[PDB]
Amino acid sequence: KVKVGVNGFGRIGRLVTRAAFNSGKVDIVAINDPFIDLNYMVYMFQYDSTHGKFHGTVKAENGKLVINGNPITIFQERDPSKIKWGDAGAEYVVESTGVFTTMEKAGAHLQGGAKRVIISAPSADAPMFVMGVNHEKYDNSLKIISNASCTTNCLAPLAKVIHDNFGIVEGLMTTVHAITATQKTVDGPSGKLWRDGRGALQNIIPASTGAAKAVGKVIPELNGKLTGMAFRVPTANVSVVDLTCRLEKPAKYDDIKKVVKQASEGPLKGILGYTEHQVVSSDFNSDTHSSTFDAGAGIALNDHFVKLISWYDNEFGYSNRVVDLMAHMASKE
Template sequence: MCFIYSARPGPAHYGFSWVFGNSIYIQLHRDSPNSLAFITMAFSSLLKPTASLVRPSHRSQASCAGLHHSSNSVKLQSSVFGDAVTILQSSSLQKSGACSIQPIRATATELPPTVPRSQTGGKTRIGINGFGRIGRLVLRIATFRDDIDVVAVNDPFIDAKYMAYMLKYDSTHGVYSGSISVLDDSTLEINGKQIKVSSKRDPADIPWGDLGADYVVESSGVFTTIDKASAHKKGGAKKVVISAPSADAPMFVVGVNEKTYKTNMDVVSNASCTTNCLAPLAKVVHEEFGIIEGLMTTVHATTATQKTVDGPSMKDWRGGRGAGQNIIPSSTGAAKAVGKVLPELNGKLTGMAFRVPTPNVSVVDLTCRLDKSASYDDVKAAIKYASEGPLKGILGYTDEDVVSNDFVGDSRSSIFDAKAGIGLSKSFVKLVSWYDNEWGYSNRVLDLIEHMALVAATN
């Protein structure tokens, strides 16, 4: 077993590590204040037992002949592994072509990344209001996490039997792999765990406290303001997470600004699926090169609000046209919302959407003017470093010839497509990033809740 450490200049804050053969390569920046922490993280990852991996995941591999070029090395004996540790002090970074890293491949078999437990002595107990696309997937995903316990679901339009059916069978994500049974009109049993079912129209009437739910996922699409969502607190809920953009609730994107959450924020928004895709990408590009201004287009899969055939839509005439027959231009606030989670980009981004006749997976096109001169390869390298380091599990990277269906069931918020983008000049680039607008977003809803629980526990 061999460890190789390489100190190198820029980009500003990102480092990465990868496995090749029997060696672990750790690449950090010379001035990074987090170098020791990153090395510790890399060592710790080796100690995790492989038995803890429930399903296979694709590890990145590398071929880096350039690492042996003009480097001074010192061998140390490791008391942990009993093998030599080689420390390389590199004088300069090899050109991006010198190190070829296999990208993370999109897969529907990966479990969602587990965030630290809240350490409250048990799982974080949540309730779900609204059993639509997001509500059902939040429940599906939660049943495979060991840090979340769904105790109740409320939907005034769906009874227990129909809930069980809709959870089990999904035309996009397949048949649910766990066990589901209906015990009575108000109780489901999922994987041996009982979940209470209610059908209240008014959030204030849902007895969340009696049902044991501390956090509520507001996924009905109706109660999206602080005032309306706060009605859940009357029934005993402590915190509410709105699974949609909100006009006035604090907005969070995990991996971007969740650390600004404060315990006095009782109602928060998880933003939109598109903002969750765009914000991590914009964060990396802006921190490394500076974004002067940018335009975003999302090519977005069909959603439940669209019409199957032409129908009335008084506020949006084009939105009333048949979803399966048309490419429909539409508005979106996703790009402007990035300015709420990254204030330094406020007023610098805007965008629009094209709704297309596919059932799932969307893609963001960010075209932006950079403050610092950078080639497209420079931008790719910065995104790759971030995807393998501080934003791993949130931001992905691929240079394979992928299409939208390859990302169905991908739990990451944003997967950068290195081959799809292009650079016009040293300061003008088009960046492309994929996202499962259902599955990835639902994972982030739960990650945000667990982060809130962790903050509550530490305070």
């Protein structure tokens, strides 16, 4: 029902658009990207190495990007404050360029007529939300919000179930993550982050990530009780969270499995999945869950110290959550 504008037609921008058209929860009416012109957008949206060809029609007609017969107004503005979102009917704007993540920068979309902005990435100051964890805390006074990161969306739902049932005293996370657009094909310049400049296809690359610490923001009781790091590995998509945590209350591995499965079939259905199958990363290709607990992969040392594994299609799950968040925001109008 709510009309949406998308700033940045990258992996997230394009997949959020796909999710929107596939679920029908929101209607994309405008897209802005100064580097990708209309004809090129058709091509980028139609063919996707990771998620396959688009199911439907996508064409350029009279200057509009038409997807399944729905005309989308296209903008090519480098400065957010200059995008005429209002004229195009875009009430909500998905900020997915990665360069306007602060309240001040993301707020520029409001100058163009947009009513609310959803940053598809962590924000230093904008309120962060995670579907299934604290999205109910959202309220109409918030005009600029964040949907956190893919990794936080994977860890948070799992951590909530674990903390709620056994209490997390402290935890350390490692995410074995697929390569992303910020990486390089061969050893190249990355002045601010040297390891990230090394060839992505040749290396296992350690990288910092505030995704675990961020959980404390969506689950206040866990603030200061979690942190971790990441390892970028040579796969194009799908990542996995490895959470090592200490529990305050005794928890046999089978008890953990029971509560997680119960959560996946109830309140967290569609967000937190559960499996006992002998899965591998590709099995989650295009899987829309934010997190899928892998029962057989985890291992416990004792009743108070365990390692829990959860899979996440870092592109598809997150993109669907952005749409879900906007759908929820719309119901609160």
